[model samples]
Target: DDGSVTVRHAFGDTTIPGPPQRVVSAGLTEQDDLLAVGVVPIAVTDWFGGEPFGVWPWAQRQLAGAQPAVLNLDNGIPVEEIAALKPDLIVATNAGLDADTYAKLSEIAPTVAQTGSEAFFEPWKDQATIIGQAVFKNAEMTELIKSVDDRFTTVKTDHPQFSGKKALLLGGTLYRGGVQATPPGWRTDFLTQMGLTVLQVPALIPRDEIASVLDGADVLIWTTESDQDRDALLADPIVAQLAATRRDRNIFTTKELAGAIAFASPLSYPVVADQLPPELARVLG
Candidate 1:
């Protein structure tokens, strides 16, 4: 209740006259960011659509016994439902928000949009700061961010060999370029914090270009959807020629781990760092 909160976002600026009391986490993965700072949203928009209230298992503990209403994406975020929730703030960074949707949501409350890049991928730390500022929890958010960063730094300290290695995360599509090209998303950023340099891969390579695109990456991480997903990847057959596959320097994650990678929030990283780092060490060092 210190004063009005103003946070800069995608479309323009959002100013909240007072601390938000009823916040709706409109960004699919942004709920975790709010929960990390001890703010349980009144409602959250579902991204993947399986978990309870669309809350991932990793971030479940922070729910603090409040079961938030789950907003389905069947017709995009139901603005009417959000209004019914009586939310005071809406955090949609990385929610794939566009000008129209932002306009609609802005009518409901002080809505915050994504910060940087058109890729719809906001780095976890920036996402934290954005949400933190929106909710008036800057100090709390910074502590959690530092804790997550220190955790990664410790892992990197232990496994120095990953310092210069190149890592690739193959999931929906690829964006073949190094981190600087753009902050792809959480999955690769999680890989980067493991001390490896993540290269964004291109969206979809035709069967013919597999070999040319898959070459030279030191470690390959696959976020497979199912047996069919794995089959489609290996079906190319061209991947067999890649050094990463041949040397078995690959990490194929379960759906849960992939979820954690995609969320890439302060809470999710613990689940990732604790579990993935050792396996990363197994292949990398």
Candidate 2:
């Protein structure tokens, strides 16, 4: 056992008595942070895409040959299954686990839930730091964050047009509801971090109002589950008429690309940074 690490989060304080040997990620995206610090979780919660081990493409290499168990929390975090794994630590820092869920998990081992007011809104950097601290790799995590931050800085320097460009990100069901603009959060933060300005709707607005708001954005990012969805969105009357749409300033992303940016972790950011710049340049040109 090493020095105790105490983490203060949305569910209050959780203290890991020592370096955790066996860890389970109860959050959708915690595995990346854990893997960044050379700690592969024994299990991770299942997320949107059905990637193996709940691991996305960007961070899949981190798993090496070790296959961590998967935990499906679509219904809810399965405490009994997690306990069966006998993990010394359980991380749900990027998850939507509530107070009761946190308490139950804590009884099995030290459990770290999301920070601040929201559940899935914790910044990727903060999640990394918290997970790093829990596993006694604070310095390594700091360097990882610095390295990623430097990449953003370099990209911003190289692409001057991204600066001050008001960007809008939209998502919704393929043909169900109208296109819903993403509110200011982790996804938007990724744009702003790259020196792009994000246009946010002040309040919940109707489809017409949303379309009007979309007109003001200089750059538009739309995430669709498939090519069919992207075509459907582009063909729609409301979406096609937007100023950015007409100007061809829209960047359409499939689920995999969007998930990389949406996670916003050290592993995921590089994936976005590598791919997004060329697209931005094309749109600007």
Candidate 3:
């Protein structure tokens, strides 16, 4: 369908076609989406999971028998190892690979970019349909979506107040009292979906660490890389006196999940929906 390489997607416009015996996901987020529609990635980014990392625990439980290869992001993926897998389709959507590396991957197999911005914010339905198209599993993807959607409706109805609270999604800190918050990017789609208000800051800090400058509202959702950051934050009196703190409405998330869940993709949204509402109840009340 796509020249020599055929594209078959699962959720929407995207598609994948594999008589392809082996499929690999270059990023953990991408890997989650892959598994959601019943395709087990032969390889993936090692996020939180050790060797045989359950990478996406929720997705793993859903798939009957799913195994993934966890690649090291630091040194970069092993070229020889990936080559050995003989993958006909190479997925490097958002694994942080550059143009040179993307070209190299093309040599190995027909590659699809899942960067979203590059090809449409990995369109919610687009990603699913594309992956499904490539693998020829549209029906499976359709069913997968229905199941997840049903869950979302139930969870939202359960926590009606979270439907209107305003929040900031961020992960790290840049300076003392300066916060590095995630913008209302893709992962926070569910927040908007559930009717939560996103603080539209003029500065647009993607990872909020500066609690002082942030105007406390209904909630504060943050994640950090180190416990030392936590120690430093707990010591800040200015932060201690923030309105959000005064109101006792701060919600923190798994630092690792900050980036993945922000996109609100099919795979990650399910994880967020499970904890977000209940956590909101704990803080809002």
Candidate 4:
């Protein structure tokens, strides 16, 4: 345990001899974990929209004005760019690296891909655990995890109205119809933790049945990619007709808070606990 650590990920087992001297957080939001444990990576992969860099507002404070190279995986993993940085460890738990891609990254550095079969949807805890072990800060990571868990517990306890209620979080274009089905892990984990049962919907819920799905949920939580997306959802007649939307039982998350919830990192949870539950509590009351 003292000398080295080996992480078993989707691609296979990756062993790092010691605390990595140079780290690259290739996974979308793995940088949050790296920073939480006090090790800054040389580079971080951008997960779509955020601050100047891939780092969201919640995690930017961790930067403390330290600038790391921002990477864009939109055009496939930039192998040459990653190699140029000369990282000793590459954290890719949320990167969804394929076998060939994983192999190439391993050649660049010890790359830890997702632990589960699914590439991008690995549990946030596992992602954090991977970074902790890689950086020789497992203890710190464990403490951070405990505090975030406690945050969720506090929200759940404070809002007794949230208990046993069915909360559905919608993504994509809500106006087009459909509940915008979510993956069990990344998308709706916060809802589940807050004591709201995630209302299950099909992967593709048609426009007509959308109202029916809307009727079953106690609250509808929505986060959008853009203002237009929000407008589109609101314009949907089916959405407007729902009692949840009309009677203030809906939670419309601000973009930054949406990023915090979507990132689902230890650093982001404090922001989520602060912004989310109060809004949800208000809607319920």
Tell me the number of clashing residue pairs for each predicted model. 8, 0, 56, 0
Ordering by TM-score: 4, 2, 1, 3
Best-performing candidate as measured by TM-score: 4
lDDT of 2: 0.81
Better of 2 and 3 by lDDT: 2
Q: What's model 2's TM-score?
A: 0.92
- Candidate 4 per-residue C-alpha lDDT over 1-285 given as tens digits, one digit per residue, 9 for 90 to 100: 568799887767998998898999887889889988888888988886757768878777777787899997788778899999999998888776899999998998998888878788578888888778878899999999999888888888888888888877767464344667664555576777778788777665688887777788887777776777667777878877888878878777778877887788989888988998888888775
Candidate 2 residue 78 C-alpha distance from true site, Å: 0.9
lDDT of 3 by residue, 203-226 (tens): 344224345346645787766445
For candidate 3, give the lDDT: 0.61
TM-score of the candidate numbered 4?
0.93
Q: Give the lDDT of residue 113 in candidate 3.
A: 58
Q: What is the per-residue lDDT of model 1 for residues 1-285, given as tens digits with 9 covering 90 to 100?
A: 258888887788999888788999877788998988888999988888288888888878889689888886678768898889999998888677888999999999999998876525667788889889888889999999889888888888888999988877666323342111123455455567767887666655555665665675787777664566555555444665667778988676767777887778878888887877877888987
Write out the backbone clash pairs for model 1.
174-201, 174-202, 175-200, 175-201, 175-202, 176-200, 176-201, 176-202
Q: Report how far off residue 267 is in candidate 1 (Å).
A: 1.3
Question: Mind giving the per-residue lDDT tens digits that candidate 2 earns over 95-184?
Answer: 688889888999999998877776875777778888888898999999999988888788888888888888777763432435567788
Q: What value of lDDT does candidate 1 attain over all alpha carbons?
A: 0.77
